Amino acid sequence: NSKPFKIKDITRNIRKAVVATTISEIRTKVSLKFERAQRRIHLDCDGTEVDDEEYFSTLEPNAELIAVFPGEQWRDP
């Protein structure tokens, strides 16, 4: 294995952290942390979507993520 991760909402005002070993785990825990359903994980810096375990395994510890929920889109600045 597990690693720490930072996840924010798209406006970057809700700033939270999760410990996870798989993308399935991070998604469940991010829903519990944000109290919102069907989290989609994107990179904070560039909006890249993380939707397979292979790319999730390449992520560094304490990588900065954005949680984009249904009806939302990742925002740039």
Residue numbers in the entry: 117 to 193
Paper passage:
DREP3 is a CIDE-domain-containing protein in Drosophila and has been suggested to be a regulator of nucleases.
To further understand this dynamic protein-interaction module, we obtained a crystal of the DREP3 CIDE domain which had a calculated Matthews coefficient (V M) of 2.76 Å3 Da−1, corresponding to a solvent content of 55.43%, and solved the structure at a resolution of 3.0 Å. The final model contained residues 117–193 for all nine molecules.
